Every structure is written in structure tokens, then in C-alpha cells.
């Protein structure tokens, strides 16, 4: 097998293209038809420290592709007013330390310096304070446990390394320009580009795929077939009735309204990172890019109009959003049973969505033509390509949902009918079980979703420490061990950080 079909363009259609171009050059077939717009969500998206590996796979360095898409540093999710009003903290792109065996955020709660567990955790925290870049004005990238100038794997994938080093930063750049960047990128490499729209999926006697009808340029055949077409499910859930597992239960954002400006009122825009505001029904993304700054209001309908909604946004954002372009969109919350059926593969929206919290969109892309290149299939089909795949990135999604209801499970703010309801609402049954593990020992290897979805257990820590909602508690050995290399270790943080806050230039410039 060597002929792909890709229906869909956008992020997830050229993606998959370039990955596999990449990945297999001459000796893949690949054409992707494509219509166009659906206004993704906002013109800005955001990605895990994981997408580096994408663009080194692609052989794409950061000066080659950055600028065409307007994109910039990001390096941390900033929180805010997720405890209370006057409150923020970071989840970022650093590996946690740990002293004589335990986590530095243990020591934290039983003798940290400040009462911010971020700033004395994490180095992180205080470039993003200072709205500082995480590369020096030569191009050297900031003095941390990662090696950028050191051997690695030769074509190093990110579901094999998983975040075992640390690179520190991720990115927020213009998702139409990085799909036709990407286009180019493909197209140079002999993907066959068409515009056109699919008017019928063929299926053969055994309910397989055989091609797609378009309506210029005839029928598109091949041996897989790649959905793209989001939340259309085009392929995988209409023509091969995939059913649709539903996260809302959970989850209940099913909404979003969104919109840009040149700057944002509070500055939110000169930090080199994402802000994710919590509002009175649900919470507000801040995405940083080059000229412009894209925001966006992600709520639950049964809670707040969409009327009301958009006047909040625009309040927000202040009097540079009074009159602009502001899109409506609903959110299908969830995923496919099965990404991958008989010779189809949903890779993107087609596959599932979760609201762009921890912005994990690209993310699920990315892994997932990972998976697609690591479990490709010869001709004999062998199902166990497909249980493998399926198996895969189905505990990727479902590890990340358990992860975002997490934020607001341990949200601390009470205010709303809203944020009430967060404590009532269903919770998977693992979920309540793991909380109580974590009450007394902070989030660990064996005590998070035990099977790979992209999230160490740091993260889950940044979670508990900051929305401040869950009572937690240090280890008691901690009592009995002695506290001073811990204390060293805070110090050797704050001093690097007050070297760093000197030298390292703003973001914007």
C-alpha cells in the first residue's frame, strides 16, 4: 500500500501530508482535496512542548517557518483568577525537579521560600513575569537542563520520548498561514494538491472505501483514506457510521465566540505565553501573535447567551474590540470510538475536540500521524495495526479530558451558578479515585492515567497547586529528612532567575 487520499486541508490535512512526505518521501503517493475557511476557531493557535519534533522532523527550523506564520514564543499557560480575583500562576514547558527523591513542589508545600509555588518551582516563571524571550539576542537558547547543541535520536518522534528531556518552550502562530506554509511544504514534495469538494463517499461490498466523487475532477481513488474534515466527519462517522463518544457529561463548554485586535487593553498580548482567564461561564484564551493578538470567550451555552458572551469578550479586550468582526462557533465535545476504520483514518476535528484549555489540538494531530506512520499497514491488513492505532490515541484523548476536568474540579472560585456546578458534576470514576491518592501525595508516575497522553505528572501538579480548591498536603518524610538541599535547590532557582531577568531581551522586541 502507498496510495493516500487526505479529504480535508487545513492544520490537519496538510499535517498528516507533510509527515508522511517527510516520513516516507518517493515512495508515497498522496493527493488531498480540499474546500476550504470553517474559521477553525480563532485566527491564533497554541501547541504542546512537543511540537518541536514536528517541524525537526519536517527539517523546518524556527527563522523558516515562524515569520510566515506570524508565530511566537510560548511558554506556559497563564491562569488566571481560577483561584480568586487577584490570583495567576503558570503551567510551563519545564521538567520538575525533584530533591533526595522527592518532587521540589512536595519540599514546596512543606518549606517553600514564597507562597507562589510556581516562581520558586520554576525558572519559567519568572522569564514569562518579565514578558522575557526564552532564546538570548546570539540565538542561544536559555541555560537549562536541555542541550539543544547535543545527539539525539535520528528522526525522534514525540510518542517514544514522551518528555523525557525537556525542550523548553512551545509555540502561538496563525493557523491558516502554518496550513499553507505547510502546502507548499508538501506540494514541493509531490503531494498532489486539489480544490474541490467530495459529493460522495464510494464503499464496495464490504462497506469499504474504494474513493471519493469530486465534483471537477472525477473520482479520487486509493488504499487509505485520511478524514479531515472535522467535525463533518465526512467519512469515518457519516459514510462508515463511526459512533460519536461524547465527553459533554463532563465537559459542558459546547460554545465560543471569538475575535481580533492589534493589542490587548491588559497587555496580555507582550507575554510570551497563552492566558486562559476564567470568566463567570467558562474562560477567556489570550493568544499572543506577531501583529495581533486572536481572543475568544469558550462558555456553556445553558449558562450564558451568546450575546452575553460576546459583550463580555468585548469588554474584556477593551475598546480596540468595540466594533470588530466577532464569529460565533459550537464545539463538538468528544471523540470517535474508533479514529481508525477499515482504511479510514479521522485524524483532527474528524477524530475529537476538546475546548482549547491546555490547546491540545495540534497536539492530538501530531500524535496521531505519528501513530499512523509507527502502525501503517501492508496489504494484508493485519487488524492489529488498527487495535494498536485506535488503542493509542483514543488513551491520549481520554487521558487529556480527565486532565482538563481536573482544572475545573480543583478550581478553587465559587461565585457563579457556574463554578458551583463544577464540584457536582459527573467525574470519571478513576478521576474521584486518583484525587483521593493525590490529597496526600502530589500527582506521580503511577498515580496519573497510567498510558501515554502527552501530559507528565508535573502538570498535574501545576493544576492542583494553583486552583487552590484541593486541600493538599506535604509527605511526612519530608519531616524527618533534612530541608537544606532543597533550600539550595530553591536558591540555585532564584539566583539563575535574577541572572536571567537581566540579560534576556523583551518578547515583543
Known sequence: LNNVVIVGGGTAGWMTASYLKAAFGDRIDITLVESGHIGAVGVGEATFSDIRH??????????????????????????????????????????????????????????????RFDKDCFVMASVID????????????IDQPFDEG???????TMSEHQGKTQFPYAYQFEAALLAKYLTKYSVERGVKHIVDDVREVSLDDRGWITGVRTGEHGDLTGD?????????????????????????????????????VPMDMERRGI????????????????????????????????????????RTLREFVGPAAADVEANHIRMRIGRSRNSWVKNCVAIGLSSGFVEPLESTG?????????????????????????????SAVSHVMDGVREFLVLHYVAAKRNDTQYWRDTKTRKIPDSLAERIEKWKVQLP????????????????????????????????????????????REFEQIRNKTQRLTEVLPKAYD
Not at 130 to 141: E, F, K, M, Y
Request: charged residues 20%; contains cysteine.
Open 150 to 156: 547535543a545527539d539525539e535520536m535520528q528522526g525522534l
Open 444 to 487: 506521580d508516575s503511577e498515580t496519573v492515567y497510567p498510558y501515554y497522553h502527552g501530559l507528565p505528572p508535573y502538570s498535574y501538579m501545576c493544576i492542583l497547586l494553583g486552583m487552590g480548591g484541593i486541600e493538599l498536603k506535604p509527605s511526612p518524610a519530608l519531616a524527618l529528612a533534612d530541608g537544606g538541599a532543597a533550600q
Open 224 to 260: 487509505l483514506f485520511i478524514d479531515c474534515t472535522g467535525f463533518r466527519g465526512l467519512l469515518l462517522n457519516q459514510a462508515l457510521e463511526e459512533p460519536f463518544i461524547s465527553y459533554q457529561d463532563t465537559l459542558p463548554n459546547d460554545s465560543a465566540v471569538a475575535l481580533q
Open 362 to 390: 495540534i497536539f492530538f494531530i501530531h500524535h496521531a500521524i505519528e501513530q499512523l506512520v509507527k502502525n501503517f499497514p501492508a496489504a494484508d491488513w493485519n487488524s492489529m495495526h488498527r487495535d494498536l492505532y485506535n
Open 271 to 310: 507575554l510570551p505565553c497563552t492566558t486562559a482567564t476564567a470568566q463567570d461561564a467558562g474562560w477567556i484564551w489570550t493568544i499572543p501573535l506577531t501583529g495581533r493578538v486572536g481572543t475568544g470567550y469558550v462558555y456553556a451555552k445553558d449558562y450564558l447567551s451568546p450575546e452575553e458572551a460576546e
Open 130 to 141: 518579565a514578558g522575557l524571550s526564552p532564546r538570548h539576542q546570539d540565538g542561544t537558547l
Open 54 to 115: 514536528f517541524f525537526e522532523f519536517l527539517g523546518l527550523k524556527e527563522k523558516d517557518w515562524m515569520p510566515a506564520c506570524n508565530a511566537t514564543y510560548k511558554l506556559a499557560v497563564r491562569f488566571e483568577n481560577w483561584r480568586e480575583k487577584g490570583h495567576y500562576f503558570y503551567h510551563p514547558f519545564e521538567q520538575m525537579r525533584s530533591v533526595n527523591g522527592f518532587p521540589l513542589t512536595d519540599w514546596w508545600l512543606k518549606q517553600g521560600p514564597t507562597d
